[PDB]
Write an enzyme that holds these catalytic residues in place. Structure first.
Site, PDB file in Angstrom:
ATOM      1  N   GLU A  55       0.623  -1.443  -0.380  1.00 51.27           N
ATOM      2  CA  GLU A  55       0.028   0.264  -0.157  1.00 51.27           C
ATOM      3  C   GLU A  55       0.979   1.083   0.193  1.00 51.27           C
ATOM      4  OE1 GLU A  55      -2.581  -0.349   3.782  1.00 51.27           O
ATOM      5  OE2 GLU A  55      -3.468  -1.550   1.915  1.00 51.27           O
ATOM      6  N   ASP A  73     -20.358  -4.915  11.584  1.00 49.91           N
ATOM      7  CA  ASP A  73     -21.114  -3.584  10.843  1.00 49.91           C
ATOM      8  C   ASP A  73     -22.516  -4.904  10.524  1.00 49.91           C
ATOM      9  OD1 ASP A  73     -22.526  -2.280   9.359  1.00 49.91           O
ATOM     10  OD2 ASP A  73     -20.618  -1.087   9.350  1.00 49.91           O
ATOM     11  N   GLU A 103      -6.515   7.849  -2.656  1.00 50.82           N
ATOM     12  CA  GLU A 103      -6.288   9.107  -3.070  1.00 50.82           C
ATOM     13  C   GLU A 103      -5.541  10.167  -2.609  1.00 50.82           C
ATOM     14  OE1 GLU A 103     -10.972   9.546  -2.572  1.00 50.82           O
ATOM     15  OE2 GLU A 103     -10.453  11.277  -3.886  1.00 50.82           O
TER      16      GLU A 103
END
Length: 129
Positions: A55, A73, A103
């Site tokens: 990453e 969740d 981004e």
């Protein structure tokens, strides 16, 4: 059907944490810790290193256990449990290696965090300081 195993890294230098901004759901548009899924037969600590390398293009050195994040969740049908490791030291310079997934990237002071933050990051930060 059942809880999945994730992982993360709280990378901290000079009272700043390295956060990366996600493009894609879940938690799209949130700044958070780097990390991801642990692979079949992979030790959790080798997963933290691999995923941060994938990453951010850096190699963690001497990461120690910080906490474990419950990501529950029910509405979106997901349950991850994610050990998060603290690292002060690495080699290489952080960059967004995968522009399709992230981004933005930055060092942020722990008293002046960007918003919104991933759940995993909020829990991790409650431990650090």
């Amino acid at each position: 059907e059942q809880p999945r195993v994730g992982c993360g890294a709280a990378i901290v230098r000079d009272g700043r944490i390295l956060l990366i901004k996600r493009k894609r759901a879940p938690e799209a548009g949130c700044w958070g810790l780097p990390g991801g899924k642990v692979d079949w037969l992979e030790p959790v600590e080798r997963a933290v290193c691999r995923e941060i390398e994938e990453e951010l293009g850096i190699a963690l050195e001497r990461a120690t256990l910080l906490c474990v994040v419950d990501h529950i969740d029910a509405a979106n049908g997901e349950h991850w449990v994610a050990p998060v490791y603290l690292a002060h030291a690495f080699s290489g310079e952080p960059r967004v290696v995968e522009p399709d997934r992230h981004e933005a990237l930055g060092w942020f002071a722990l008293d002046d965090l960007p918003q919104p933050l991933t759940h995993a990051t909020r829990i991790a930060l409650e431990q650090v300081t």
